[PDB]
Design an enzyme around this catalytic site. Structure first.
Site, PDB file in Angstrom:
ATOM      1  N   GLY A  10       0.788  -1.219   0.000  1.00  0.00           N
ATOM      2  CA  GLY A  10       0.000   0.000   0.000  1.00  0.00           C
ATOM      3  C   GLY A  10       0.821   1.270   0.000  1.00  0.00           C
ATOM      4  N   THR A  15      -1.711   6.993   3.142  1.00  0.00           N
ATOM      5  CA  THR A  15      -0.752   6.868   4.228  1.00  0.00           C
ATOM      6  C   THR A  15       0.541   6.264   3.717  1.00  0.00           C
ATOM      7  OG1 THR A  15      -2.638   6.527   5.713  1.00  0.00           O
ATOM      8  CG2 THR A  15      -0.432   5.957   6.634  1.00  0.00           C
ATOM      9  N   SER A  38      -0.764   1.444 -11.264  1.00  0.00           N
ATOM     10  CA  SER A  38      -0.638   2.505 -10.269  1.00  0.00           C
ATOM     11  C   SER A  38       0.760   2.427  -9.651  1.00  0.00           C
ATOM     12  CB  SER A  38      -1.753   2.365  -9.247  1.00  0.00           C
ATOM     13  OG  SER A  38      -1.687   3.480  -8.316  1.00  0.00           O
ATOM     14  N   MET A  87      -8.161  -6.918   1.653  1.00  0.00           N
ATOM     15  CA  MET A  87      -7.259  -6.745   2.800  1.00  0.00           C
ATOM     16  C   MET A  87      -7.028  -8.060   3.514  1.00  0.00           C
ATOM     17  SD  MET A  87      -8.438  -2.957   3.938  1.00  0.00           S
ATOM     18  CE  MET A  87     -10.157  -3.438   4.036  1.00  0.00           C
ATOM     19  N   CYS A 109      -2.251  -1.958   9.376  1.00  0.00           N
ATOM     20  CA  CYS A 109      -3.288  -0.976   9.672  1.00  0.00           C
ATOM     21  C   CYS A 109      -4.664  -1.549   9.351  1.00  0.00           C
ATOM     22  CB  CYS A 109      -3.013   0.241   8.805  1.00  0.00           C
ATOM     23  SG  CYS A 109      -4.125   1.636   9.143  1.00  0.00           S
ATOM     24  N   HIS A 132     -11.641  -5.496   7.496  1.00  0.00           N
ATOM     25  CA  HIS A 132     -10.650  -5.252   8.547  1.00  0.00           C
ATOM     26  C   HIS A 132     -10.727  -6.280   9.673  1.00  0.00           C
ATOM     27  CE1 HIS A 132     -10.413  -0.724   7.354  1.00  0.00           C
ATOM     28  NE2 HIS A 132      -9.370  -1.371   6.847  1.00  0.00           N
ATOM     29  N   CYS A 188       7.023   1.400  15.158  1.00  0.00           N
ATOM     30  CA  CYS A 188       6.755   0.042  15.603  1.00  0.00           C
ATOM     31  C   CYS A 188       7.812  -0.935  15.111  1.00  0.00           C
ATOM     32  CB  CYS A 188       5.378  -0.367  15.072  1.00  0.00           C
ATOM     33  SG  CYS A 188       4.006   0.388  15.947  1.00  0.00           S
TER      34      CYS A 188
HETATM   35  N1  LIG Z   1     -10.109   7.977   7.772  1.00  0.00           N
HETATM   36  C1  LIG Z   1      -9.684   6.926   6.970  1.00  0.00           C
HETATM   37  O1  LIG Z   1      -9.560   7.101   5.748  1.00  0.00           O
HETATM   38  C2  LIG Z   1      -9.432   5.656   7.696  1.00  0.00           C
HETATM   39  C3  LIG Z   1      -9.631   5.537   9.039  1.00  0.00           C
HETATM   40  C4  LIG Z   1      -9.322   4.336   9.646  1.00  0.00           C
HETATM   41  C5  LIG Z   1      -8.844   3.268   8.900  1.00  0.00           C
HETATM   42  N2  LIG Z   1      -8.667   3.438   7.566  1.00  0.00           N
HETATM   43  C6  LIG Z   1      -8.101   2.295   6.835  1.00  0.00           C
HETATM   44  O2  LIG Z   1      -6.592   2.564   6.872  1.00  0.00           O
HETATM   45  C7  LIG Z   1      -6.028   1.868   5.797  1.00  0.00           C
HETATM   46  C8  LIG Z   1      -5.103   2.810   5.030  1.00  0.00           C
HETATM   47  O3  LIG Z   1      -5.908   3.833   4.427  1.00  0.00           O
HETATM   48  P1  LIG Z   1      -5.274   4.779   3.309  1.00  0.00           P
HETATM   49  O4  LIG Z   1      -6.256   5.878   3.125  1.00  0.00           O
HETATM   50  O5  LIG Z   1      -3.869   5.131   3.624  1.00  0.00           O
HETATM   51  O6  LIG Z   1      -5.223   3.806   2.043  1.00  0.00           O
HETATM   52  P2  LIG Z   1      -5.597   4.034   0.511  1.00  0.00           P
HETATM   53  O7  LIG Z   1      -5.326   5.477   0.163  1.00  0.00           O
HETATM   54  O8  LIG Z   1      -6.948   3.475   0.266  1.00  0.00           O
HETATM   55  O9  LIG Z   1      -4.473   3.152  -0.206  1.00  0.00           O
HETATM   56  C9  LIG Z   1      -4.661   1.762  -0.361  1.00  0.00           C
HETATM   57  C10 LIG Z   1      -3.355   1.147  -0.869  1.00  0.00           C
HETATM   58  O10 LIG Z   1      -3.514  -0.228  -1.008  1.00  0.00           O
HETATM   59  C11 LIG Z   1      -3.071  -0.599  -2.387  1.00  0.00           C
HETATM   60  N3  LIG Z   1      -3.842  -1.772  -2.787  1.00  0.00           N
HETATM   61  C12 LIG Z   1      -5.184  -1.932  -2.877  1.00  0.00           C
HETATM   62  N4  LIG Z   1      -5.504  -3.114  -3.460  1.00  0.00           N
HETATM   63  C13 LIG Z   1      -4.273  -3.685  -3.699  1.00  0.00           C
HETATM   64  C14 LIG Z   1      -3.999  -4.894  -4.322  1.00  0.00           C
HETATM   65  N5  LIG Z   1      -4.953  -5.823  -4.760  1.00  0.00           N
HETATM   66  N6  LIG Z   1      -2.723  -5.274  -4.450  1.00  0.00           N
HETATM   67  C15 LIG Z   1      -1.698  -4.418  -4.046  1.00  0.00           C
HETATM   68  N7  LIG Z   1      -1.958  -3.212  -3.438  1.00  0.00           N
HETATM   69  C16 LIG Z   1      -3.262  -2.868  -3.296  1.00  0.00           C
HETATM   70  C17 LIG Z   1      -3.435   0.572  -3.064  1.00  0.00           C
HETATM   71  O11 LIG Z   1      -2.764   0.519  -4.382  1.00  0.00           O
HETATM   72  P3  LIG Z   1      -3.278   1.310  -5.765  1.00  0.00           P
HETATM   73  O12 LIG Z   1      -2.431   2.543  -5.898  1.00  0.00           O
HETATM   74  O13 LIG Z   1      -2.989   0.342  -6.854  1.00  0.00           O
HETATM   75  O14 LIG Z   1      -4.698   1.617  -5.573  1.00  0.00           O
HETATM   76  C18 LIG Z   1      -2.873   1.738  -2.222  1.00  0.00           C
HETATM   77  O15 LIG Z   1      -1.506   1.724  -2.233  1.00  0.00           O
HETATM   78  C19 LIG Z   1      -7.172   1.301   4.980  1.00  0.00           C
HETATM   79  O16 LIG Z   1      -7.371  -0.059   5.179  1.00  0.00           O
HETATM   80  C20 LIG Z   1      -8.383   2.129   5.472  1.00  0.00           C
HETATM   81  O17 LIG Z   1      -9.648   1.458   5.343  1.00  0.00           O
HETATM   82  C21 LIG Z   1      -8.915   4.614   6.931  1.00  0.00           C
END
Ligand SMILES: NC(=O)c1ccc[n+]([C@@H]2O[C@H](COP(=O)([O-])OP(=O)(O)OC[C@H]3O[C@@H](n4cnc5c(N)ncnc54)[C@H](OP(=O)(O)O)[C@@H]3O)[C@@H](O)[C@H]2O)c1
Ligand SMILES: NC(=O)c1ccc[n+]([C@@H]2O[C@H](COP(=O)([O-])OP(=O)(O)OC[C@H]3O[C@@H](n4cnc5c(N)ncnc54)[C@H](OP(=O)(O)O)[C@@H]3O)[C@@H](O)[C@H]2O)c1
Ligand SMILES: O=C(O)c1cc(/N=N/c2ccc(O)c(C(=O)O)c2)ccc1O
Ligand SMILES: O=C(O)c1cc(/N=N/c2ccc(O)c(C(=O)O)c2)ccc1O
Lengths: 206, 207
Positions: A10, A15, A38, A87, A109, A132, A188
């Site tokens: 990711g 993040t 990507s 995930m 995460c 999750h 961590c």
């Molecule tokens: N406020 C919030 O947004 C919030 C709060 C709490 C928890 N969270 C959780 O925290 C985590 C991190 O969130 P974030 O906003 O930093 O993440 P994000 O912007 O959604 O980024 C997701 C990452 O995962 C990669 N990914 C997705 N599918 C994949 C696949 N099949 N194979 C390889 N890589 C893959 C994506 O790659 P691509 O570039 O190819 O898409 C991107 O690098 C998530 O699980 C989210 O649900 C978010």
């Protein structure tokens, strides 16, 4: 350093991009797994190694985990709130690769909603939260040295390094900046004190 | 009703199967299991009375497992299948035929709560197994056997409580049931007729 080679899953995400930038600045030798469509932005920090592929392919995860000291997991579905197993199935592949390659430390995460009363989780986020939950179970049952990072809302506030880390419960603020979340994932790597715990990082930006 | 002492468990080596088996042995049931690999059963602690080594896809192996039972528990699953698969529904056809042949009238079988919710709740990877759960549920409902359909949400690892809620022909209030509570509920369904012909959704809030 003791921990020097890390895989980030990711890294192109909200993040992940700041975690990668902080890790490269701190001297880590970073391997990323990126989907073919990507790649990391051209002008940004460059990792040491790039694997192109998908976290749903055991072969691609194996290539990314081989030879590392530790793994950071920042997988997600970007804006998409649809039902998903990416995930949890990605975590199953990561666990299997870590066991096969002798890597123990995984900092992954999920979400503070894993610490909420389930009746209060917003229904629009229940499908993502269900995955999750599946992911956290995979990582907890693996026996690996797993730090369960469970952040609340991820914001765009600065890197401070000054956030609160609440163990095994909800913390006193409902936000963490993406930069502080990445800073904590890297912190961590240097300590065992969070292994086997849930961690909720949060801060008040002022 | 009719006192159940002898049961077959299908899927006894799975995560829910193992604890349902342990709890059934501790409670006094005489348990027969069908396992593809007997090394996947624990060598210590509670052990089943009878082990049939074989496959749910082989009618003869199923027949040998169902012979002589008072009721059947079905905890089959195919976690690794993400594209069309018929193992569970074909297994259920074999179970039904064997129950009819041996006069066994009671079956308590696990599918999932996706069968109670809108189909768009199903993650794409899980559509194939959900479609086969639907086929299995239809096989059991059309059999005329006394059938309790157990349709759980997320199966967790929390300790047994015996304190979960069961919602009848609909969804209840939590989206998790511990594997231990789910196993406890499968066994409870052997002691009563009240869930026969119904779908059941066990759930609970842990800690
Ligand atoms: N406020 C919030 O947004 C919030 C709060 C709490 C928890 N969270 C959780 O925290 C985590 C991190 O969130 P974030 O906003 O930093 O993440 P994000 O912007 O959604 O980024 C997701 C990452 O995962 C990669 N990914 C997705 N599918 C994949 C696949 N099949 N194979 C390889 N890589 C893959 C994506 O790659 P691509 O570039 O190819 O898409 C991107 O690098 C998530 O699980 C989210 O649900 C978010
Ligand atoms: N995981 C969840 O949160 C969740 C939620 C809702 C519903 N469900 C559904 O609940 C049910 C039980 O899940 P679970 O996690 O407890 O199951 P599991 O751990 O995946 O165990 C599956 C069981 O079925 C056996 N099995 C598979 N194919 C067989 C075959 N051809 N012949 C004989 N036995 C066979 C397996 O034997 P081996 O040990 O030989 O492999 C194992 O004992 C599944 O149908 C699942 O889809 C799961
Ligand atoms: O697109 C989104 O809106 C989104 C939001 C997510 N999580 N938001 C959280 C999680 C835990 C929390 O505690 C809080 C809070 O306290 O407000 C908010 C996850 C993926 C998403 O795609
Ligand atoms: O391969 C697997 O792991 C598997 C998992 C399944 N999960 N089903 C549900 C149903 C309702 C739910 O609410 C939830 C949840 O909340 O996690 C999960 C079904 C078939 C499978 O083969």
């Amino acid at each position: 350093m003791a921990v020097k080679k890390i895989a980030i899953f990711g890294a192109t995400g909200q993040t992940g991009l700041t975690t990668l930038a902080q890790a490269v600045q701190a001297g880590y030798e970073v391997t990323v797994l990126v989907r073919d469509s990507s790649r990391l932005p051209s002008e940004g920090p460059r990792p040491a190694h790039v694997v192109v592929g998908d976290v749903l392919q055991a072969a691609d995860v194996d290539k990314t985990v081989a030879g590392q000291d530790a793994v950071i997991v920042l997988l997600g579905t970007r804006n998409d709130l649809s039902p998903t197993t990416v995930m949890s199935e990605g975590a199953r592949n990561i666990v299997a690769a870590m066991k096969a390659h002798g890597v123990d430390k995984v900092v992954a995460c999920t979400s503070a909603f894993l610490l909420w009363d389930p009746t209060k989780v917003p229904p629009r986020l229940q499908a993502v939260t269900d995955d999750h939950i599946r992911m956290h179970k995979v990582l907890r049952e693996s026996g690996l040295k797993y730090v369960a990072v469970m952040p609340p809302h991820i914001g765009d506030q600065p890197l401070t390094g000054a956030y609160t880390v609440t163990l095994d419960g909800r913390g006193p603020s409902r936000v963490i900046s993406k930069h502080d979340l990445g800073h904590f994932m890297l912190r961590c790597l240097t300590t065992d004190e969070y292994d086997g715990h849930s961690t909720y990082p949060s801060h008040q930006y002022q």
